[PDB]
Design a binder for this molecule. Sequence first.
Ligand SMILES: Nc1ncnc2c1ncn2[C@@H]1O[C@H](COP(=O)(O)OP(=O)(O)O)[C@@H](O)[C@H]1O
Ligand SMILES: Nc1ncnc2c1ncn2[C@@H]1O[C@H](COP(=O)(O)OP(=O)(O)O)[C@@H](O)[C@H]1O
Ligand SMILES: Nc1ncnc2c1ncn2[C@@H]1O[C@H](COP(=O)(O)OP(=O)(O)O)[C@@H](O)[C@H]1O
Lengths: 252, 724
Amino acid sequence: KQKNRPNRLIVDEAINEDNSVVSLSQPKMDELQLFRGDTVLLKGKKRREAVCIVLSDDTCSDEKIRMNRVVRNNLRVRLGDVISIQPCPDVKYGKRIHVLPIDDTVEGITGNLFEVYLKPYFLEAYRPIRKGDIFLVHGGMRAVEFKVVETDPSPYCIVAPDTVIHCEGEPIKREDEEESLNEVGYDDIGGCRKQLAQIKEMVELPLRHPALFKAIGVKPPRGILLYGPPGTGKTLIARAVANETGAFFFLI
Amino acid sequence: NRPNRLIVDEAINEDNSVVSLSQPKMDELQLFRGDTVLLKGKKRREAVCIVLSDDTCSDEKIRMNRVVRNNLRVRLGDVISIQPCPDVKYGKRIHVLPIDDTVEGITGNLFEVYLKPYFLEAYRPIRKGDIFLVHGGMRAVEFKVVETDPSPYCIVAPDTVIHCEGEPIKREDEEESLNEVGYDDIGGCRKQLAQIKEMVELPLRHPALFKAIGVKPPRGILLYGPPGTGKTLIARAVANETGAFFFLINGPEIMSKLAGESESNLRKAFEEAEKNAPAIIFIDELDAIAPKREKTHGEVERRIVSQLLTLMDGLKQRAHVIVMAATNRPNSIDPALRRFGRFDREVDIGIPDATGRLEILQIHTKNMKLADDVDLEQVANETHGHVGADLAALCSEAALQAIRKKMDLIDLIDAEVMNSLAVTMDDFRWALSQSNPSALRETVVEVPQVTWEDIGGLEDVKRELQELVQYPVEHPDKFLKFGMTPSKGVLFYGPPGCGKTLLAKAIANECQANFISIKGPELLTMWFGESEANVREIFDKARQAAPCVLFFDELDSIAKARGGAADRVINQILTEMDGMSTKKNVFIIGATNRPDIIDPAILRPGRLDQLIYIPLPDEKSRVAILKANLRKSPVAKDVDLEFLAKMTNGFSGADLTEICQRACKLAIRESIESEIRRERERDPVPEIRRDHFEEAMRFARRSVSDNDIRKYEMFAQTLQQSRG
Ligand SMILES: Nc1ncnc2c1ncn2[C@@H]1O[C@H](COP(=O)(O)OP(=O)(O)O)[C@@H](O)[C@H]1O
Ligand SMILES: Nc1ncnc2c1ncn2[C@@H]1O[C@H](COP(=O)(O)OP(=O)(O)O)[C@@H](O)[C@H]1O
Ligand SMILES: Nc1ncnc2c1ncn2[C@@H]1O[C@H](COP(=O)(O)OP(=O)(O)O)[C@@H](O)[C@H]1O
């Protein structure tokens, strides 16, 4: 590994007022394979995750990250702790997004919350979110928080202009935010790392490396046999090495 | 003093395909006035040029153009070599890509201006990477050859279509050449490639032999062996060096059609061969097409077998058509398929040897940029047999984890980055550990390299073995001078020994014949399984190796461990030994420990006649045994061989070698102790101390039993053939 797990970062105050924007430094994004318009997967305390877009900053420190009070409260952390950043280069657009406001933020106001709050907040914005993000929407001389309920890309997605926004009546309240349904990943795969690393290599080298197999001349993993007792996460492994790599799965 | 060595000189003719040589050097090297030659240069660059006789040319010197000099990576004053090469023939497809620095200012079609008048009825031979200059339009254009389909040996024919896609060559590893041909591409089976070249080369280029031969000597040749050593590699290599229609078909594609079309594309395939005059038509995994009759459940497969039989019978001498085929085993296919007249000469391929594995590794590392820190010779020594596809996967996996060891690039890669393939000893060792022996269960056919080293004794016994085995190999006419039938069966007995196996390997090395060792536990496994047909396969593989040395060890162990003399393998051994040719020098050598329990039919005169007791090894001749110990931990000097010749009086040979390696293990553990002390502070001392040898002497006793050696003396007294 490397020194002190260098994806660990210090939370700091930001300059941008955007909720879904966190700030890094120039050689940090180059070392972490990050672009100026790409999306990441932030992870923090209390097993709470976040999806954000890393933008370039000049006043940001080398080993710190600048973010506002929304992601700090979403990660359930205060000023002075440590957070981690993971790259998320395989995000797909969303199809249906359910949002429900908190009860104290809509007391005194009535009507449709889509055309006033949700439509200007996502008008060609492409802000990425996860399941359980409470994001602050400004409008009507007030500040109303809106919480993600359920998306059809269930772990993580980007709000497309074709995404139907669901803001039906009788919303839920602030709760323990229990998890009930998700899509699999490498963390969903259990203890197989002595062979998971091998098959990770034999599928990662096919990923975005056409000329590398020309340098070999032949492609080494032509056919892969995965054998064991019936039910050892087999289609879980096959589905896991597909979505995070980024491909078409098409199981038969 | 190897007169192929020539001196480069300036040419007389301005052609890039004509070299000038003297008249007395053309007749000495057996070349015509338009013969094609193999001109080797530097940076492994080679070219073919038509030799013309010149009166002003020197004998030692050859005259060639600046184009040929720059293509051969030589300057004025270097040396080249020449080989007679008459099998250079016409080409099918030629792809050319011009070099980017010489194509500025000209636009349009360059095929009818440059490519067409340059090759108009000139028969110019070229190679891969050849840069030849073409003039026209008050300019001069360099053209680099990408790929021709007879890649090592081609001549540009007027019927060859020239692929002239106008584009500069990209500065990456994206060349358009892919899977062309090669006798440089076939790895390690020269001793059978010469045989199959002898069978199928006579259909090539000579239709005039049919009057003398009456019936064509090939009609079909099977190519059987373990999977992974190139059926289609051999068949594609023998294709397009001759120049014919290859037309590979595979048995799964034949069986993949439905009813009514599985019958189709078989007469259609053979008629589509019959539109062309020659045929090297090859079927892939034909054992799936034609299994055993009892293995067939349905009858559609039997219909396909019947269709193949009708096509093979009806295609009798129909204008020199040959069908190539491959399978796994001779008994795996239908025995009705081996009708004499067609598919007759089932030649063997087998596993490659260590030299064959070495040249497989060399050929598969030719294209990729080796870092040259490795020498790759000893990599074939640690393996105990890995097949050519396994070695291709070995090279691919080693390069893959070598690229994986270094970090990824900035984004998404240049060729110089791809030229930095710094493969090490540990990289190939890691790839060797991360592999599998897919063909280890197969018997390994190879020549050994013992070369008279382990045994410093048995003075007249080795003379008897030499005159019995080696002397018929060099000259068997002396046995027909006076009427001698050689007794191929010999038996070695006494205390247990691998030195007799080393003696058999030394005999097979002196004869330079392939050696096959039949394991005693393998015979025991065939005895408990009662699979007596496997030794028929053993003897069928044995008779294909001519000559061969067949070794059997511990034949008394079958009668000793019989608990289910008389045994199922033993009568089969007697039956197969009776069914042997008196020629071919397929000598049987036997090893055993207890001669009292033995088959009494095998001690009868006839097949096994000479019975030789092998005694204890010489304590006075332990210099050769410690010479064998001078490899695999060479002991340093200031040691006494007389120290191991003082108290050692009845100790076994391999016991002495393993106790020397145990003293070596003491040296390795004290070197590990020295490294531990050196790392604990913050040379391995390769010399071996006398205390290791003293503790080796105190921890080794003989395996010699007194009752055993007096019963061996009783066997010698029973078979007492002594001079009075
Ligand atoms: N190694 C594993 N780790 C986590 N969950 C597993 C594992 N193996 C099986 N499962 C669970 O079993 C269910 C079916 O998986 P599995 O039986 O492996 O499918 P298949 O047999 O088709 O490969 C999934 O819902 C998954 O949650
Ligand atoms: N040096 C090599 N380069 C590329 N492929 C090879 C090489 N040696 C063997 N092969 C592969 O091995 C495969 C199987 O051939 P095989 O069945 O072993 O032939 P055989 O009839 O001699 O048993 C072929 O498809 C061929 O592609
Ligand atoms: N007839 C014999 N009597 C004593 N020693 C022998 C005899 N033949 C060979 N030797 C030596 O004794 C050694 C013992 O070989 P070993 O490997 O123990 O036999 P095996 O191969 O049957 O296990 C051999 O290396 C050889 O140098």
